[PDB]
Subunit: 266 residues, 5 copies
């Protein structure tokens, strides 16, 4: 346990993010574009597996998918690129610790979200171009899943988004709490396995699911209005999970009782 | 044989725990709540697996569940949060070695247990709101496991609680004996694999098994007395394993001539 | 972060490649022949798996193939040898950073591509002499995959090439951002799993698919023009993925404005 | 290479073991009882797996059991506790190297073996009390395995005991030759997978097999004479494996010329 | 790249090998006997797996065998012992680099191969003594594999030997290029997976195949003439793989010229 020094690290990470965005908007967006595409890469893989195993009628489908998703956030952490869902915790913590402002935060949130989206779009276009989604069980898996995510009640999506970002941000948190790159990756594998297989909802990952589906030639049963719906619900859920739970939580754990230079702890 | 070193570390962690509690009840409770929720997260995953593979008739169900539970304690150890079952060995070793009093130990136990339960209630509530336990195999898996755990005889729950916490605490003990975070996670993986697949009982994990089931409107036979009955029996077993075996054992190996 | 240091690292690597080729063509080409052979070894392993599981009607075939391909880039990275696809990002980043020139880049690309191919030819020849492709499902998996890769339309091949090298180059990128060799190998394993199972195309691996198919006794529809066609389409796609995305992207991330 | 430094370290461990026993019999026996229990925990896990998979008619049963046994020696090594079988190599090398006496070695063997059995006995008692061996495939697995282990000809048991302790002791030798805890656990995992799946015999793991089978009222296939018969023949082969092969061998590798 | 550094490490290792042999024949031979037996342990495990899964008609047999062979060379590398196949690259590179003579190289090859053989013979005898090859699918897997290896044409064996020792030697080369013991083991794992599942031939592993096959009364399918035929062809292939590819290749990469 050193929660204080962890709090200092999240604060420094928040500071550097806003400093970077102010410095170069292109640098910051390109960083966010990579991250969105890196996450999407995980989606292409596990949806391929979904199509493959669903068509075969395997009971192991959802387990294999979760076991296979680690690459999404592992690429993000190992490239040091900008992922919206992680910024929920980092910027929240930083702000409570007075390193960054509410404006600084909404800004990072806004642009990371947008750049991630750009990444998914580019990935979506390129993947469809491969013809792997022209016809088949994988194409169908994208179709069916895109539809289900858009057709499900806001409350359900909302809560799934909370639990997702608790898991995604806690893996990010572990990355702050260890110097071992291999331990980072392992904690990410565990958290992404738990979140994918348990059926929680990740906003950035969905950007690619719909990106691929709306760019896909075969029918739709998608209704881009649906994509927006899903994305709104999951995003707010994510924010709560990251900002309300992990951000505030790590702040509470690490803030020195002294200071006390504002507020007092029971 | 770093046994004296190890006991010095347990004792120091025990001291740090109670000082934290005395310094801040909110910080102690929040840390406890996180650890309760992180463990419950393991349960959500392995019960999803449980539902899926049970409904398939697979012989691999309990093996895959065991292999998949590592995240529970991995998250706890890697976040530095407060977990009741682990405090059983730490506070007992630290007390035997005169770093902390019995009152300190009793308090730390009461508070982490209550913190953990709070974490489980929040998780159980939020999980239910996802609608994932509304209906189907995962819902049924919660409903049936909760019931069999609440109706099992006391001596059996108790002895299962003993073996579980020997495994949970020995994995915490390993984390004190290595500087390698990967090796910590590996040993956690092994010990949680052994305890889940063998059929041992974890009090804090059960808190989520019960919060989910009770909070789920999809019908169940457990109730509160059922949940309380299991929790009491498993907690007592957990304490015996952690304190009487691991705490006393490590104190004996580590104590000064 | 450390994007600037990462760009410095790629620029330095890109500089050392051209300096090496300028000092010794033999060394450069020997290094390239090794890498081409190391990648092809991954192809032998997973096509053997392909032949085995396809024959069995397993739904797991492509998944097991992906999980088992890690050796291909792990060997290259752990031996420090010269792979054409990795050089798409390294040389493009170093070129934008003015460590090396465009001519340096096309020279390095030409030499590593050809040297890679020499390794593939050598490997295919020796593999055929083992008798392991004389007949049976492995021989058939080689014939069938070669045929389908060569008969696929250009656009599809090109885009699969793009996504393949994004993954391969981002694995190399990771190897520059960690001092942990285990972490390098793990990231390579994840990226190669993703690209093999997703259906993406790697020019250098395809060299072995084709040298094996064309050197072996078992009759196919492939021919030579087919191999060349596939290799042209996938190479261009690989170049776009490694150069336009990873090379340009890491340069933009690390460049002092 | 470091054969000399390795022998030095084995010698030192032999010296530290005898000193520990001389200083405190209790500390020594308690360490021994932990190790015997930790080994036994691996048996509880894999016999659970055995009952589940056998009951299912799985061809993978013995493979999954081997893969799942690593916890047994991993716990011992990571907690630094006293295991009879490892002491076959350590004491024999140490004695050969003039660090410890023949009588010292005899004493460490007797105490560690008996203390290990104390751990198995205690574990068997508690595990029976879980009700997990009451009736079903896990109880049948214990009962069937214990009977076949007690009815197997001496020669076959003895030789199985030799190969077993070459594997266990070589995994302890590896832990002496690396500073990476993660690599220690990997090597233990491999060697334990090899010995369980191949069919080799480990005296201390067997103590738990017989303690569970004998303490359980719903298991009557063996009795005590059957257990002694097996344990005597497996212990003798263990000794030969660890002392005559590993101990003598590493001494010959490391000794001053 | 650090190709010169690697060649220097290889050259130092060759020098150290020949000094060892010159210093003590007994030490050199004991070391070789260990490696031969450690490699054979891997054979005992994967042939138990082969017999189990072949008898069940599993498509996964050769895949699980390849995945399970890592112990063979992991033990050799972690105990620092003398393996003939590895010495093909090490002595070869150190010779080209003028650290050791052609005669030193012949000597080291001769002694390690014979020593490796002594370990295989001992392991064979003891394994037969376990009764584990008395009868059933494991004995039959041994009998059938020995026979197919004995009847295979020379060219096909030779080329299989080449590819096998590229893999074994590149895995040894990897261990000279990293300070991470976990990474060494991982690369060894991947290379042995590749060579076993693909169908490549390893001379020292084959020693234990024929050892068990010739010592078991219940295995009739082969003669000493067959074993010798296979061992000669496969050894020659191994030498070409280790010395002419890896040895010469690494010399070329690393030579200051
Ligand atoms: C909002 C939730 C707050 C939970 C705090 C629980 C307070 C318990 O407090 C402690 O309980 C122990 C026994 O149960 C006693 O032994 C201690 O003396 C006592 O301080
Ligand atoms: C409660 C546990 C008591 C354990 C006591 C074990 C002591 C055994 O005693 C030892 O036995 C050997 C042979 O039997 C002798 O050769 C040793 O000299 C002797 O010290
Ligand atoms: C060293 C091997 C393990 C020894 C275990 C001895 C426990 C015996 O104890 C008793 O004996 C009877 C038959 O054995 C059983 O029927 C009883 O249930 C059991 O309590
Ligand atoms: C158990 C006995 C094993 C002894 C093996 C010795 C075989 C030596 O063999 C020879 O050694 C010479 C130099 O020493 C080489 O020059 C020869 O090429 C080589 O054949
Ligand atoms: C089951 C297989 C998982 C293996 C994961 C290995 C991760 C180990 O961790 C790594 O190990 C190295 C030790 O050799 C260290 O040098 C590194 O610091 C460390 O990150």
């Amino acid at each position: 346990r050193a929660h204080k020094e962890t709090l200092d690290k999240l604060t420094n990470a928040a500071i550097n993010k806003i400093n970077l965005l102010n410095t170069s908007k292109v640098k910051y967006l390109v960083s966010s574009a990579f991250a969105g595409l890196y996450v999407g890469i995980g989606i292409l893989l596990i949806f391929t597996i979904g199509g493959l195993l669903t068509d075969a009628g395997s009971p192991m489908t959802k387990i294999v998918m979760g076991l296979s998703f680690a690459i999404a956030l592992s690429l993000v952490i190992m490239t040091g690129t900008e992922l919206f869902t992680g910024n929920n915790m980092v910027m929240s913590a930083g702000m409570l610790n007075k390193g960054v402002s509410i404006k600084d935060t909404s800004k990072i949130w806004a642009y990371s979200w947008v750049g991630n989206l750009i990444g998914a779009l580019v990935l979506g276009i390129i993947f469809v171009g491969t013809g792997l989604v022209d016809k088949g069980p994988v194409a169908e898996f994208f179709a069916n899943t895109a539809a289900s995510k858009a057709s499900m009640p806001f409350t359900a999506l909302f809560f799934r988004g909370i639990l997702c970002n608790i898991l995604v941000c806690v893996s990010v948190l572990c990355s702050f709490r260890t110097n071992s790159d291999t331990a980072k990756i392992i904690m990410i594998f565990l958290c992404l396995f738990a979140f994918i297989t348990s059926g929680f909802e990740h906003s950035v990952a969905n950007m690619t699911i719909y990106s691929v589906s709306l760019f896909s030639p075969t029918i739709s049963t998608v209704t881009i209005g649906g994509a927006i719906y899903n994305l709104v619900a999951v995003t707010l859920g994510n924010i709560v999970g990251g900002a309300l739970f992990m951000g505030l939580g790590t702040y509470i754990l690490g803030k020195e009782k002294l200071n006390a230079a504002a507020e007092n702890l029971y």
